[PDB]
Amino acid sequence: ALDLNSVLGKDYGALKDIVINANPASPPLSLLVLHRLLCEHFRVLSTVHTHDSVKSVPENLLKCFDYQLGFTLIWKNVPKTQMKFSIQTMCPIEGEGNIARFLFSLFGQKHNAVNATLIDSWVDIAIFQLKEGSSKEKAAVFRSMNSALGKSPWLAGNELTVADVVLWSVLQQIGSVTVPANVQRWMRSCENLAPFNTALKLLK
């Protein structure tokens, strides 16, 4: 796997420090999980702040956390989770699915075109179908997941990917439908990981 430097490239320096704006009424569990994953792998300086946009953030949210990455979470009254970078030639990045993809990419694991796209496809299913979705659509998503998870331990293969992080996390924050067997197995395999159950209990 690729080192952090070559992953970010020329501006490793620019991107080493990450800022995320999140709404306390809608904390992005997927990012919390990914923060935990990053900390296991990298030396990470983390910080929480509270924008004047909001008042009375609960404590767990407030206490939710020579380095390699800087990682600042700001509670704010934003309509959508948003990541900003020091380079501001670029646009702010909106949507936890997109931020999660970037963060997961920091681990430098290589994927061919098919597998990388399959991973992206699962993140979109989480964001575009599951999260704001119908009950009926949710059952269809479950069927599709159930089929994939009958063929491999994780959504996109033999390794954990951002597909798993995002889809598991979204599933926790919507709460109904019968959970099929492969999905149940996968759910407990996810929750068995410290980064996952740790972040989840934070949101209590």
């Binding site: 992953v7 490239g9 949507g95 993809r101």
Partner: protein, 167 residues
């Protein structure tokens, strides 16, 4: 040969624009049909438009549709969602189109300085958005979006896709 079946009744313009831009780089067939299916290999298909775009951009590396670095790739992911979620709704269009306008104020193409999946996705989505067509009709389109939209529209690939698929 990769093969893309399309919903002929409602053509995925974004995907067809991507095909038009990668077709000299990778061999692709487009077939008439009633749904969108990119047939990659025997056990491998993609049926959602954004996955179809991503796969084409990934396999046609010389076309440069997914940007040239991680930050650009990320920005392109941002715009692919923006079109799928904000620009695909008619609720809140004014704020959405204004946001697009502001991002375009200092840019010629959405990401970097060349055509990317972000332009293809946002342009196609805009073109099929009724609120956009209404703003154009009423001469109320925001300046930067109008400028960017017209520039792409005039390009050869876009004209070609339009001739082959516009009703």
């Amino acid at each position: 040969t990769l093969s893309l079946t399309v919903n002929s009744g409602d053509p995925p313009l974004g995907a067809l624009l991507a095909v038009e831009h990668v077709k000299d780089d990778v061999s692709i067939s487009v077939e008439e049909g009633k749904e969108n299916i990119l047939h990659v290999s025997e056990n491998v298909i993609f049926t959602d438009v954004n996955s179809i775009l991503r796969y084409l951009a990934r396999v046609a590396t010389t076309a440069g549709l997914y940007g040239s670095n991680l930050m650009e790739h990320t920005e392109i992911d941002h715009w692919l969602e923006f079109s799928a979620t904000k620009l695909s709704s008619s609720d809140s269009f004014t704020s959405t189109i204004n946001e697009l306008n502001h991002s375009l104020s200092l840019r010629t193409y959405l990401v970097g300085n060349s055509l990317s999946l972000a332009d293809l996705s946002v342009w196609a989505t805009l073109k099929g958005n009724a609120a956009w067509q209404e703003q154009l009709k009423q001469k109320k389109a925001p300046v930067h979006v109008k400028r960017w939209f017209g520039f792409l529209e005039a390009q050869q690939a876009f004209q070609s896709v339009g001739t082959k698929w516009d009703v």
